[PDB]
Design a protein around this ligand. Structure first.
Ligand SMILES: [Zn+2]
Ligand SMILES: [Zn+2]
Lengths: 410, 410
């Protein structure tokens, strides 16, 4: 009956037990700030925001850390294309991303560590990796050696043999020596930049300790990004680093993966010009977070229509509460409605406890809404207690899913 | 650890396991509506409202039924004194009690059954008792026989030998034949009125099923009222009737019990004329619901001062949130404040799980408030995440205790 989560590390559903009672330390991989956020970022971060909201709803104190990679080769390439500075562009798109997450009613992360503010910690981490023998120096930087970590391939399941101044093809850069014209920082191994995988591990170990509960990200990050993270962390610490791994499914456009490389990406700013943020949240939440999400305009229209139906139900409840009277007795209709509301709340909690299955939770919500509409149609004089219980259930739904916020604000 | 409640039937703390998953059926003995409510009713109903709020906060659907004894010999006495019809006085004081409970921010019960609306059910229950060999017909009505029920006295601990148209002194009235000038109802045993004990059992069995979870009331209701209800229900049904019995402690005035018999009672409306509803709620919640409450003006002043301190803390948080910035990193002060807030929430839940101990919960609340005041004093630029977590904790406290309503409603 407890909350179970799907662990990608074991590829199975396990009962959720945090390391420290009453606290969930969750880390999610933030976006790379070089262009406007698209629907994949919205899907991933809305799913993890709903996970955070539900964990807080169950009584946990959630410390959520989302990194802000503000230096990368893609960022430098974009700055060179636009003739800007790789830092001004990063700051501008960090602000754009924060505004977009604020618009989508996503709760801001508790800490937003930046790479440029944690260079020394990364350098110390790479030095500690080198003194343990897990790193070597190449002609163009410091590289991590995969074969010295026997448990490589634990998360994704990719074998080393399949992967086969870098010694081995499967090795990866921990510190890259600087090219002329690009940003760089002083280091004992030469002036350069950090790698694309050391940053998240360094920030997570700095702000959450050597071990925390939940590491999150996109499904593409399973390999090589998160495998690199777990390899580096267990090489540096020698013990388990992340207890539960959560990955959101891909967003699909006409049967292919949504990404900026193929150019089939729709920005959040573009969607906001056509749909309300709660409509986008409902469209994201209509599918399980591990399942692929097919992006169609008809799907968004259907989500809009369903959200409008729920809005109409809430407005009808509000209107009926103006003339609702106290119940000195309950008929068969009142007991039927109460039973449906109670069963809907139980099914909502059961669905959210089953790997955050928001689809069944929405099914329960719609069952409760249909029952309330039937009760308001059939009851000659609506009872105040029934409407109050319905509003309590919808308030729980609002707190968990982040919808109906304007209705319950008033 | 799960939620534990103090069962008076076993006189010990037991893990709270409802009969049906996700549903708690609670029954509270209502007030005798013939005079203005006093502080004892406020204490009892505020304690049970906090219990209901916490049970709903834990995910349970709570169906709470509070009965109304609109016909009573004391009501007839007051009606004869005032020269008013008993029913009109009963209805007027029903309205007065509802207004007083609405003022005290007490959530209304789902069902409010009335004795005058359930005469036929009471007659059916008495007939079922008679045909089961548990009641007899006396000179002035129908009386329940205690000797037929061997388990009498398991709640209050009172022995039958200590208690020794009634066959036995320990017998009690089930139906009382109508005296001239009194309201009367037709019955197979003659015109009369129901007793004060049959109503609660009849209404509870009617609206909460055959057996429900929680039966509540004052400490004076342990004997004879609730023992009589146990006897009637277990004689009529032949199985367990109530799983958990909760009784609020007495309210003391100058070391003696407060009741209208001694004339040392203060009405709720007088305190409302002198204090705010949340101050009265805080004063009630300063002590455990099972512990006696000493009514002093200095105690109310201290509760008002503590609630004003909490209001000042919330106002400081609100003011600081206007200039609060996001967190790119956390210093030792931010981590210390976060740790204290997390531990305060954990201790709040641990205290409320320990037989609804509101005193320890309030101590945790004040610890969190002191920590956040210290943080706002020593923070040169407060972080938005820390203030948001503090506001979430205080929102949980507001939802459970029913205080801070104005701050979070706006
Ligand atoms: Zn990462
Ligand atoms: Zn009673």
């Amino acid at each position: 009956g407890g909350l179970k989560v799907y662990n990608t590390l074991t590829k199975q559903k396990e009962e959720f037990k945090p390391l420290r009672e009453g606290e969930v330390k969750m880390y999610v991989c933030g976006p790379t700030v070089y262009d406007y956020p698209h629907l994949g970022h919205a899907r991933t971060y809305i799913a993890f925001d709903v996970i955070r909201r539900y964990l807080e709803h169950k009584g946990y104190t959630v410390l959520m850390v989302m990194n802000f990679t503000d230096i990368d080769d893609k960022i430098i390439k974009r700055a060179r294309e636009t003739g800007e500075d790789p830092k001004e562009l990063a700051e501008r798109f960090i602000k754009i991303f924060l505004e977009d997450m604020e618009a989508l009613k996503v709760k801001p992360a508790d800490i937003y560590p930046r790479v440029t503010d944690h260079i020394d910690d990364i350098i110390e981490f790479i030095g500690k990796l080198k003194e343990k023998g897990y790193a070597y120096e190449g002609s163009d930087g410091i590289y991590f050696e995969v074969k010295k970590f026997p448990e490589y391939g634990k998360l994704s399941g990719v074998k080393i043999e399949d992967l086969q101044g870098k010694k081995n093809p499967e090795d990866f850069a921990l510190w890259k020596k600087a090219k002329p014209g690009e940003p760089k920082w002083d280091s004992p191994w030469g002036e350069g930049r950090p790698g694309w995988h050391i940053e998240c591990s360094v920030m997570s170990s700095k702000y959450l300790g050597e071990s925390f509960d939940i590491h999150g990200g996109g499904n593409d990050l399973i390999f090589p990004h998160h495998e690199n993270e777990i390899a580096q962390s267990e090489a540096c610490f020698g013990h388990e680093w992340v207890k539960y791994w959560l990955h959101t499914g891909f967003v699909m456009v006409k049967g292919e993966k949504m990404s900026k490389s193929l150019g089939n990406f729709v920005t959040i700013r573009e969607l906001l010009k056509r749909y309300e943020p709660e409509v986008i949240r409902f469209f994201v939440l209509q599918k399980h977070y591990r399942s692929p999400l097919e992006y169609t305009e008809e799907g968004l229209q259907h989500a809009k229509n369903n959200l409008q139906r729920l809005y109409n139900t809430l407005e009808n409840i509000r209107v009926a509460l103006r003339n609702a009277e106290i119940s000195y007795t309950w008929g068969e209709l009142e007991f039927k409605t109460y039973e449906i509301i109670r069963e809907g709340k139980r099914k909502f909690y059961e669905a959210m406890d089953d790997d955050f299955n928001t689809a069944e939770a929405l099914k329960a919500v719609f069952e409760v809404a249909n029952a309330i509409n039937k009760y308001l149609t059939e009851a000659n004089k609506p009872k105040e207690s029934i409407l109050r219980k319905a509003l309590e259930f919808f308030k729980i739904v609002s707190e968990v899913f982040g919808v109906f916020e304007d209705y319950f604000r008033e």
